[PDB]
User: Fold this.
Amino acid sequence: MKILVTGARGSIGSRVAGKLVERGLPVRGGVRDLAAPGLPEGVEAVQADLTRPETLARALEGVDKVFLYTVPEGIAGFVDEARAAGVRHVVLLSSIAVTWPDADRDPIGRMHLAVERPIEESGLGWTFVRPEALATNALGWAPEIRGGDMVRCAYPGAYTTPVHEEDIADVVVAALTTPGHRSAAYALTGPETLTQAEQVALIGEALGRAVRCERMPEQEARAVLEGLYPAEVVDAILAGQAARDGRPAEVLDTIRAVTGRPARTFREWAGDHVAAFRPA
Assistant:
């Protein structure tokens, strides 16, 4: 039976799809548009747009297992189609934000809870993968780092525990291909809690040049962030960073527990993505 990897041209989805193909498994790669490049080799491309759950009926034909991204507006329709198709297991890319005390008020927590809860109620087998900060969030600093030796952050001293996308993909693949993960919810962190300034410096080390981090005033940071996210999400981002300012975040050994391999370091991530931070 086939595995449908939704978002198979995405950072995580593409790596999930590639790793399943390396394992000889029949993989369908979900895309919004069949005509666009970037799908990994060996994947059967199918239209699977999670915002328009009617595309799933064809995409889910002969499918036993699904890798799902969080798209709350179509989850009811996904659940109905997965059930109709006889899907046995859904692995969801969620967020560690659902594990926090204020999850059901936090916009990010709420968004992910809005998909987890209906899956929990559906009768479908599931695994939730709940990462903390994505190491790929550092790619937002590329313009600054390509152009100079300084990055400006609202909270240079805020800690996160950034997690490499390959580790997320490895946990997903483990959950799709081995027993024992049914109703498991895996909170993933990288192997070290690091401040924003520390992360910026580690990118410097990958580049072979020193890169510095200076603080942006909150009014200016809020102005930049309100161009990128809804208001309530900007509030949650800054409130979250304030809470972690000079306060080391939790490091979990979940990646090693699931895969048998220690989590990839942010230093390794920066080496892996070093070309993104060099000038053109």
DSSP finds eleven helices and eleven strands in the chain. The first helix runs from residue 11 to 22. The first strand starts at residue 2 and ends at 5.
